[PDB]
Design a binder for these strands. Structure first.
Ligand SMILES: Nc1nc2c(ncn2[C@@H]2O[C@H](COP(=O)(O)OP(=O)(O)OP(=O)(O)O)[C@@H](O)[C@H]2O)c(=O)[nH]1
Ligand SMILES: [Mg+2]
Lengths: 39, 55, 40, 484, 83, 24, 102, 32, 55, 55, 112, 154, 111, 133, 41, 42, 153, 157, 90
RNA sequence: AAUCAAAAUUUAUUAUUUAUAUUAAAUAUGUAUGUGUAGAUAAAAUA
């Protein structure tokens, strides 16, 4: 969506990796194969 | 034991107590949903005759 | 046709969920191998 | 990317199995190539070799105890030399003319190989062979359908004919009992013959054992045999089978009856030369052949159909079915079995469970999609202890060792011969996933293993290569981001 | 469960009502429940108690109410545009 | 081409015969 | 009925009767050893004894080539003819289909 | 023609009760 | 052989390598995650963040 | 190409397998000659249907 | 009990002999007819107490002769068949000089 | 073969448009592989057909996203380039099936259906026991009995 | 195949026992069972649509006999058929009246 | 004789084009297995070489089409409600496109392929000639 | 290369629906007549 | 006494609402049985 | 929550019924004496089933890890799959013996054909008034079948 | 479980011999038993029954019942002999209920024989003292049973 | 085992139907040989269930049983869509 | 607002149809394209 300021706060104590139940965002997709180039 | 016209007039008049169901389903009878008209035919046969051990 | 009665989890049919943890552990192993390559 | 295919040289062809290699552009990613560095005229010597090699083509003398649950191969010239009759019911489904001729050496194969090795000099080890068979004339091999029954029959025919032993091989018993047509025996009253199967047998057994049948002198054989102009009277057993099967129709129809009768008579008198007799599907020789007796109105004679008191033209009827003991071939076989004066003939046979399925109800078989169209219409249970005079051996399905070796041979030697995936190796899964999945689908049943190896083409729900290509493409993209 | 051993009743125990088939749960509500032009009190409240010919009566009442509301707004537009 | 001539003139004939309104 | 069971040919009960009568005239064993008790060929059908009858066939060509007529007119059942057809399935009293008689 | 159609013989016809054609072989007249 | 086959995987569309995933028509239908899905999967934490929190 | 021309030996509803152009007509020419050739009315049986005054 | 189970085949079920009397319109005549039929069935079933000739026979599914027994079907009259076959071969080799095909009907199978 | 009736020809695009029903039915595609595997022949256009339709059935229930607009026709033409590429491989297997089956039927002494050509035996369309008494497109009367394409002794 | 149905008397057996055919005759004496003479032994066809448990219309009694042309002309069908006395037809004959008030009383009596 | 569009001329290939629907049974596969077994044990290799030649001719990889090439050369959008016209157009358009007229299959002898062996001596049926020298 | 114009117009006259074309053209003539009548007052 | 469930009798009818459409109305009635088990005849 | 769902409560009751099944106690019960078709016909096929031992690869793969690797192979119900939680390790993890006569249910089709016809024909072959204990046994049985047009009526 | 065809194909437009489509009356269907019910052309009592669905369904039910009967009778390697109660073996000295009367009875749960008594088949060679007392010459030979404890090829000796 | 018969004979040895039954063990990263399963058919009984929709129902049944046995198995099995019910009738 | 038997309604005869199945010759040349009626419904870009 539009650009906001969420997540830009300094997290206290720097322990943002040990919280394994954190929000992981929407599920992104990846290509299974590189399509040939257009030009 | 009436025609389709008389059945529609007695449905629209309110004399009968009939329940409307979807016109492409099989109603509510589990034998009718299972096998159709022939299976309910055989079930009425099984209730009327074949459950009795004849003597 | 119109597959609106089909759930969203059935239309792409995203299988292969067992391999993701193996891929992540392999990625961590390759990062540590690259750190070993850069130091020597 | 990294091909290593232009650098690959072909190893020198020693046997037929080494010559079965495809071009390198086929199996380049199916069978991957490794590089080794040896120390000859320099410290690096880049030698590109294959990860997989073909199984070794071994003589039956060279097969040993350590080759149990391993895979070996036979040459195509040895296949033509040792099997002119053919193979079992489904043995040749895994050998096209491009494929190597592979065989799995199981534990029971090793037992029967040592048994045939002791048969070759039987008069010294007669008490040992009596203790092995428990005094019986031979072994009958039984198990569920699709096991290694007919494959083991071809293996012991290979073992017996590789050691210069006179070997009778009936590769399919359903050409005798469930044959095309039945004819009464010419010189045996009350007996019947399968003429086409007898002609093929008298051809192929003669051209298989010509080495020893030419030295076989005729002991009980009449010398006033009917003989056309220019033909020689037979003085050998090979000459007798050549008199039998080589003829013009319809003189061959009675010539095969006379030849089978006198061949079974000449076999029953030899007490010094060991004769191994291998029959695929002895359970068809132990019950009724599918022919029935003719109606007696056919032989009685009729003037007309209106007033003769007959119904052959009006209504069909099922007459009593002809048993196998009324065939002259099985008559000579049972004469050698039941008479105890023959401590010389070793009947290493098996059964077949090739029959059609029936599970309580049966509709009509769909003519397009029918795996059992050439199957037998029998439906009868069988017990090898009660219905045969031989010692029963129970073969079950594969254990995981034999199944792993067989599937490795199948997949890798089909991709090496240019009959597998080849360039499309990246679409199918790896060997561990294929082994797990085919072990699920088959239950390690060998015919089921072959059928699901062929049915691996239409697997819909394998997602290993998709996630692997996703991970490798993502790793390539982050590596290019690291390079920038 | 048994009432004599029930004390804290377990509710919504993941008994799947989508394995068995009860799809025909259609209901017919009267037209204009929150409409400002349709009155809350009326003789059409007597249409709420009728079971045998329910679907056709609800469709006919909805068609009649749509027709009279369309005619009312048409006459509203014609009179407010004619002056 | 005959179907094109029909699609040209036949709407005019069917308008004049069937669905032409009354005048004055 | 539909199969009109043919005339009884003399020695066709088993293979030894056919071998002794027609093929090999000097056959010593005339028939198979028959037990002293009664064998029931039709099972579990009780057939009138002393009557020539046929067993159910085992091959497909004997079932196919046997002159059996097909159904042509409307089929009838001895109890399901009070009910007219499966679409005019007549019920006298509206008892339940799981109604067990005491 | 279902079972025994081949058993019909030429003595079964009442050939004396009609008059046949000699060229075609068809029945040309019937006797009262 | 899997170690060797990992390096020669045809990641691009070529002669025998076909997409056929609807990547041209729909585009990126299969998901992929770089995080361990808790608590089904486990990746051990990096030593730098551990030592930073420890210090 | 094949089927672009019409061989006069082959019928018009069928399609010829020959690729040659010489001695063949275009299909507009075949359409004009089929519209040209079809002027005749089949002969009416007078004796098969009696007159209306007779009936 | 065995004779009662065989004489009442489907009227016995789960250790209970059941008779559904539907013959007459009234239930009193139906229970009279049911009592009569029960007494008739009991009097017919009680005949097993008279002797062993009224004990009902056990129906055993006796197998056909096995393959070990069918193997001896080839050796039936073995020496007679061999002595016949030698003269049949002599008849055949004398008949081969007349025609190309010698039918077993021309050797041992009598037709007329 | 026991199908000897006169048949109706179909265009190859209508066959492949059936997809998983008849063309890429998995039971049918397996027994086509057993024909090529028996002859010692690599099944490469059949494996090319199976790998395409395996992934084609995987996303066939997904709805395509709406295209808001492109200046050049390059991503639309690339999606059409691969689409007509997948049809031509399946056209090759459609010819490879009809090539080898008519070649095997000449080896197994198998008589085909009506108006069906076997290259070794019957260059014209072989017709046997048709409802029409003559040859439908050769305009020749049919003899009785049917034409034998092979020798007698089995 | 084609054979003659046999019978052994208990006086002929070395151990006497009651046969099954005279037990069938005793059952037919008790329950008045008709014994058809022309019933062929080859025609033992079960109603496999109802008898088989792996069919959709499974009812453990054979609902229809496997006989083409089991019609009204056959007297054994006439003997075992249900008579239409006091079936639903009797209710239809005495109930389906164009006015129900002529079924509860006479109109002259009520007036 | 009611001429129709089902002529299926036998000219442009070993298969007649617009071919009749053919059907394989497993009985055909068992007969083929027995035939290949007899040909293998008899030593006959000519028919195997003819089958390999047909496989080398008709089973090469088809070329990737150029950008702008489509299989509907004709616009199939104008046949909206005339369905029988669309079916007749499809059968005529595929009757025109014979297997001689693919042009994306490298069938001719001028092309080379490293996948399949081209000479019959390269196949392992004659290995004793090329053993070691 | 696209089709020429005259075969495209003749093919559109050949394969399209007649009844839908007739109904749309007749209702178009009716709409034009109502516009002319509304202009005439 | 206890009450035992019984399956309801349900019979549907297929008739025209006109060849236009088919109406599906079902007659139905519901059953509860009451089991009284007494250890004597009263 | 409760313990099991609707279909899970049904098949746990069928195992308690077969655990206390005795065929002489099915005297006059009717079709309620039929002893859970799945587990009953499995016992009748023990002449064909013949529960095999673990395979030679399995007992080698375990005993290498038990002895040569000092880390015992535990069952999939013993795997602590949750990272971040310790599970209370339920007692049915490795104590259930693998026997083919118990589970899974595989039977002969002829026994299943005979079971399904015998269960429907013996539906009303029940003796209600038996000389017994409580709610099963009685002297007279009254059933009052009430019928009305609505289910709440 | 069986994968053969049971139902008849329904009535529709006249099918043609195309791909995935067989004509409604073909010689391949039902062994050619549709030859009785076919019309070769592309009297009302002989034309109306070939088009009725219940008639053709009853006919294919009869044919499938004939196939089930011949496959059940081809399974039979035995025959039923009425043996008296005294000479029968110990497993048949009980009260055997009729078919579909009781629970399918196990043979001997005390002697660990859990199998149906109705499927039990006894050998002819073990009942020669019962079936043949009048011969006295032992018409069938004794069945040779293998020694299970003997060291043979099966036990690596 | 499905209704007393093993899975290779119920689905007529078809790999594309039995792979759907194998799939809930595959997505769970579980070995199939450590589990016994019996599947009872409660719908319409037919002589053969060798089709893809019956195999879909079999997969959903095996996946729900695996979820009921081990609870954490619901984390991959819901992500593969094996626990998800579609509503398509005829 | 002042009535009455169309097909309220049943049955039959050279005769009127549409359907029901029967139903064939014909290479000397030239040749023969519909609207619809139907069943369950699981491909898609010249405007
Ligand atoms: N090469 C090789 N193949 C084997 C071996 N064991 C089993 N097979 C495969 O297993 C399949 C079964 O072979 P058969 O022996 O004919 O099967 P069967 O047990 O006789 O089955 P039935 O004929 O029905 O009785 C064959 O097609 C072989 O491909 C073996 O030891 N060596
Ligand atoms: Mg075999």
């Amino acid at each position: 969506g539009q650009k906001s300021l969420m997540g830009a706060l300094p997290a206290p104590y720097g322990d943002a990796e040990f919280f394994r139940g954190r929000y992981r965002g929407p599920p992104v997709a990846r290509p299974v194969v590189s399509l040939p180039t257009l030009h | 034991n009436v025609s389709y016209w008389t059945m529609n007039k007695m449905v629209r008049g309110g004399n009968l107590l009939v329940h409307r169901v979807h016109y492409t389903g099989w109603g509510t009878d589990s034998h009718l949903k299972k096998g159709g008209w022939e299976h309910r035919w055989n079930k009425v046969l099984q209730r009327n005759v074949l459950q009795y051990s004849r003597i | 046709d119109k597959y609106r009665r089909v759930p969203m989890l059935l239309k792409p049919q995203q299988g292969g969920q067992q391999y993701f943890n193996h891929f992540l552990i392999r990625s961590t192993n390759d990062r540590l191998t690259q750190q070993d390559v850069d130091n020597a | 990317k990294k091909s290593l295919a232009a650098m690959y040289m072909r190893p020198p062809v020693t046997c037929y199995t080494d010559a079965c290699e495809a071009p390198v552009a086929m199996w380049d990613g199916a069978i991957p190539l490794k590089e080794t560095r040896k120390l000859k005229n320099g410290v690096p010597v880049r030698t590109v070799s294959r990860t997989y090699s073909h199984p070794p083509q071994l003589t039956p003398t060279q097969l040993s105890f350590n080759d149990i649950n391993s895979m070996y191969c036979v040459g195509n010239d040895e296949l033509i030399q040792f099997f002119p009759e053919g193979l079992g019911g489904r043995v040749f489904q895994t050998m096209p003319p491009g494929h190597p001729r592979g065989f799995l050496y199981r534990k029971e194969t090793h037992l029967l190989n040592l048994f045939v090795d002791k048969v070759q000099h039987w008069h010294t080890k007669r008490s040992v062979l009596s203790s092995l068979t428990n005094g019986r004339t031979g072994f009958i091999v039984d198990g569920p359908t699709g096991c290694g029954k007919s494959a083991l029959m071809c293996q012991v025919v290979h073992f017996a004919r590789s050691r210069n032993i006179v070997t009778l091989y009936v590769p399919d018993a359903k050409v005798w009992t469930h044959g095309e047509w039945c004819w009464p025996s010419t010189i045996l009253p009350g007996f019947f013959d399968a003429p086409d199967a007898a002609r093929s047998f008298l051809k192929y057994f003669a051209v298989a054992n010509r080495a020893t049948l030419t030295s076989w002198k005729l002991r009980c054989t009449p010398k006033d045999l009917p003989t056309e102009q220019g033909e020689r009277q037979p003085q050998n057993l090979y000459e007798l089978c050549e008199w039998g099967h080589r003829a013009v129709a319809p003189a061959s129809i009675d010539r095969q009856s006379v030849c089978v009768k006198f061949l079974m008579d000449e076999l029953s008198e030899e007490k010094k030369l060991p004769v191994v007799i291998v029959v695929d599907g002895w359970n068809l020789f132990s019950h009724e052949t599918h022919f029935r007796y003719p109606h007696p109105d056919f032989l009685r004679g009729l003037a007309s159909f209106n007033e003769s008191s007959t119904d052959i033209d009006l209504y069909p009827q099922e007459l009593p079915r002809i048993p196998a003991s009324r065939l002259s071939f099985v008559r000579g076989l049972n004469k050698m079995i039941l008479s105890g004066d023959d401590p010389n003939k070793f009947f290493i046979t098996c059964t077949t469970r090739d029959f059609k399925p029936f599970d309580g109800i049966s509709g009509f078989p769909n003519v397009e999609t029918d795996r059992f169209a050439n199957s037998l219409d029998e439906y009868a249970p069988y017990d090898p202890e009660k219905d045969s005079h031989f010692h029963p051996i129970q073969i079950g399905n594969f254990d995981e060792y034999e199944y792993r070796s067989f599937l490795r041979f199948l997949i890798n030697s089909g991709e090496l011969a240019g009959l597998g995936w080849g360039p499309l190796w990246h679409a199918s899964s790896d060997f561990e996933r294929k082994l797990y999945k085919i072990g699920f689908l088959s239950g390690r049943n060998p015919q089921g293993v072959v059928d699901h190896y062929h049915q691996e083409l239409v697997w819909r729900y394998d997602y290993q290569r998709t996630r692997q290509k996703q991970y490798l493409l993502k790793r390539r993209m982050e590596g290019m981001s690291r390079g920038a | 469960g048994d009432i004599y051993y029930d004390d804290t009743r377990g509710l919504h125990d993941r008994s799947p009502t989508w394995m068995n088939e009860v799809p025909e749960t259609r209901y017919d509500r009267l037209y204009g429940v929150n409409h400002p032009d349709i009155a809350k009190i009326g003789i059409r409240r007597h249409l709420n108690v009728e079971y045998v010919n329910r679907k056709e009566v609800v469709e006919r009442d909805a068609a009649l109410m749509k027709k009279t509301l369309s005619s009312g707004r048409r006459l509203r537009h014609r009179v407010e545009s004619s002056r | 081409l005959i179907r094109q001539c029909l699609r040209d003139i036949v709407p005019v004939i069917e308008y004049r015969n069937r669905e032409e309104p009354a005048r004055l | 009925r539909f199969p009109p069971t043919p005339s009884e040919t003399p020695a066709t009960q088993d293979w030894m009767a056919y071998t002794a009568k027609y093929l090999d005239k000097q056959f010593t064993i005339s028939a198979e050893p028959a037990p002293v008790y009664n064998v029931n060929k039709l099972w579990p059908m009780q057939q009138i004894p002393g009557k020539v009858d046929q067993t159910p066939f085992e091959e497909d060509q004997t079932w196919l080539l046997h002159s059996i007529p097909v159904q042509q007119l409307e089929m009838h059942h001895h109890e399901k003819d009070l009910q007219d057809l499966p679409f005019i399935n007549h019920e006298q009293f509206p008892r339940s289909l799981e109604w067990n008689a005491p | 023609p279902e079972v025994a159609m081949h058993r019909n013989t030429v003595g079964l016809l009442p050939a004396h009760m009609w008059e046949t054609d000699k060229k075609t072989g068809k029945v040309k007249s019937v006797k009262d | 052989e899997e170690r060797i086959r990992e390096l020669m995987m045809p990641l691009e569309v070529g002669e025998n390598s076909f997409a056929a995933n609807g990547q041209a028509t729909h585009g990126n239908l299969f998901y992929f995650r770089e995080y361990p899905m808790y608590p089904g999967e486990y990746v051990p934490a990096e030593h730098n963040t551990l030592s930073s929190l420890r210090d | 190409l094949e089927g672009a021309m019409h061989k006069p030996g082959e019928s018009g509803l069928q399609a010829g397998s020959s690729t040659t152009i010489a001695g063949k007509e275009t299909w507009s020419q075949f359409s004009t000659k089929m519209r040209y050739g079809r002027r005749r009315i089949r002969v009416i049986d007078v004796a098969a249907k009696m007159s209306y005054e007779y009936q | 009990e065995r004779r009662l189970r065989i004489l009442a085949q489907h009227r016995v079920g789960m250790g209970v002999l059941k008779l559904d009397a539907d013959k007459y319109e009234d239930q009193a005549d139906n229970v009279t007819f049911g009592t009569t039929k029960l007494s008739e069935l009991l009097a017919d079933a009680r005949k097993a107490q008279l002797g062993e000739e009224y004990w009902p026979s056990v129906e055993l599914k006796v197998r056909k002769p096995s393959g070990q027994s069918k193997a001896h079907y080839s050796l039936i009259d073995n020496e007679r068949i061999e002595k016949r076959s030698r003269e049949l071969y002599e008849k055949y080799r004398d008949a081969k000089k007349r025609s190309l095909f010698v039918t077993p009907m021309e050797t041992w199978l009598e037709v007329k | 073969n026991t199908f000897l009736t006169s048949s109706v020809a179909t265009p190859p695009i209508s066959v492949i448009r059936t997809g998983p029903k008849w063309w890429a039915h998995p039971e049918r595609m397996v027994r086509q592989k057993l024909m090529y595997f028996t002859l010692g022949v690599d099944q490469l256009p059949l494996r090319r057909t199976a790998v395409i339709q395996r992934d084609l059935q995987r996303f066939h229930m997904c709805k395509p996203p709406p295209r808001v607009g492109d200046s050049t026709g390059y991503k639309r033409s690339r999606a059409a380039q691969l689409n007509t590429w997948y049809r031509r491989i399946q056209y090759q297997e459609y010819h490879m099936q009809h090539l080898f089956t008519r070649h095997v039927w000449g080896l197994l002494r198998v008589y085909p259906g009506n108006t069906t050509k076997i290259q070794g035996k019957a260059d014209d369309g072989y017709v046997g026991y048709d409802s029409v008494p003559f040859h439908r497109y050769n305009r020749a009367p049919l003899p009785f009995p049917a034409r034998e394409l092979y020798e007698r002794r089995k | 195949g084609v054979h003659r149905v046999g019978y052994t008397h208990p006086s002929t057996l070395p151990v006497p026992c009651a046969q099954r055919w005279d037990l069938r005759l005793a059952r037919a004496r008790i329950f008045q069972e008709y014994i058809e003479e022309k019933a062929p032994g080859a025609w033992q066809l079960e109603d496999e649509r109802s008898m088989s448990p792996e069919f959709k219309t499974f009812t453990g009694y054979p609902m229809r006999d496997m006989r083409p042309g089991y019609g009204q002309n056959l007297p054994d069908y006439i003997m075992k058929k249900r008579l239409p006395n006091n079936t639903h037809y009797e209710l239809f004959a005495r109930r389906d009246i164009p006015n129900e008030d002529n079924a509860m009383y006479g109109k002259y009596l009520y007036d | 004789s009611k001429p129709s569009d089902n002529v299926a001329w036998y000219d442009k290939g070993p298969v007649e084009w617009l071919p009749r629907p053919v059907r394989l049974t497993y009985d055909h596969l068992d007969q083929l297995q027995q035939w290949t077994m007899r040909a293998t044990l008899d030593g006959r290799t000519e028919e195997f070489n003819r089958i390999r030649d047909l496989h080398r001719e008709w089973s090469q990889h088809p070329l990737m089409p150029v950008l702008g090439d489509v299989e509907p050369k004709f616009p199939l959008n104008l046949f909206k409600q005339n369905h029988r016209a669309k079916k007749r157009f499809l059968v005529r358009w595929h009757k025109a496109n014979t297997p001689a007229n693919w042009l994306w299959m490298p069938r001719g002898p001028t092309v080379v392929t490293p996948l399949h062996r081209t000479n019959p001596t390269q196949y392992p049926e004659n290995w004793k000639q090329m053993v070691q020298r | 290369r696209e089709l020429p114009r005259d075969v495209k117009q003749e093919l559109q006259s050949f394969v399209a629906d007649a009844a839908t074309t007739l109904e749309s053209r007749v209702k178009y003539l009716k709409e034009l007549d109502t516009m002319n009548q509304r202009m005439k007052d | 006494p206890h009450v035992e469930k019984l399956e309801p009798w349900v019979r549907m009818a297929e008739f025209w609402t006109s060849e236009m459409s088919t109406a599906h109305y079902e007659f139905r009635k519901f059953f509860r049985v009451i089991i009284c088990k007494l250890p004597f005849q009263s | 929550f409760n313990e099991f769902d609707a279909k899970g409560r049904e098949y746990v009751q069928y195992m308690r019924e077969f655990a206390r099944f005795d065929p002489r106690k099915s005297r006059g019960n009717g079709q309620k004496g039929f002893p859970f078709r799945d587990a009953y016909l499995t016992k009748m096929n023990e002449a064909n089933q013949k529960t095999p031992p673990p395979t030679l690869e399995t007992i080698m793969d375990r005993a290498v890890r038990e002895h040569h690797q000092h880390a015992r192979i535990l069952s999939p119900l013993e795997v602590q799959r949750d990272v971040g939680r310790l599970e209370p390790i339920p007692s049915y993890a490795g104590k259930i013996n693998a026997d083919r006569s118990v589970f899974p249910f595989q039977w002969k089709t002829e026994d299943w054909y005979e079971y399904e016809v015998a269960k429907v024909r013996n539906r009303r072959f029940v003796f209600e008034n038996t000389e017994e204990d409580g709610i099963r046994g009685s002297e007279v049985t009254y059933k009052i079948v009430l019928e009305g047009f609505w289910d709440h009526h | 479980v069986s994968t053969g065809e049971f139902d008849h194909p329904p009535f529709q437009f006249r099918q043609r011999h195309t791909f995935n489509t067989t004509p409604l009356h073909d010689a391949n269907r039902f062994g050619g038993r549709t030859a009785y019910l076919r019309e070769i052309g592309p009297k009302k009592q002989g034309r109306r029954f070939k088009k009725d669905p219940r008639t053709v369904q009853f006919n294919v039910d009869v044919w499938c019942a004939q196939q089930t009967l011949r496959k059940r009778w081809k399974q039979r390697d035995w025959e039923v002999i009425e043996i008296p109660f005294r000479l029968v073996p110990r497993e048949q000295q009980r009260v055997i209920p009729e078919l579909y009367t009781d629970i399918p009875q196990m043979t001997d749960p005390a002697r660990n024989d859990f199998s149906n008594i109705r499927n039990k088949v006894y050998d002819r060679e073990e009942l020669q003292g019962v079936l043949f007392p009048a011969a006295g010459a032992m018409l069938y030979p004794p069945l040779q049973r293998v020694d299970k404890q003997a060291m043979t090829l099966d036990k690596y000796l | 085992t499905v209704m007393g018969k093993p899975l290779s004979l119920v689905l007529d040895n078809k790999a594309w139907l039995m792979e759907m039954v194998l799939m809930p063990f595959d997505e769970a990263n579980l070995d199939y040989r450590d589990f016994d399963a019996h599947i009872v058919s409660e719908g319409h009984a037919m002589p053969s269930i060798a089709n893809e929709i019956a195999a879909f129902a079999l997969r959903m049944a095996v996946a729900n049983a695996l979820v009921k046995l081990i609870p954490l198995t619901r984390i991959p099995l819901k992500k593969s869509g094996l626990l998800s019910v579609d509503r398509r009738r005829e």
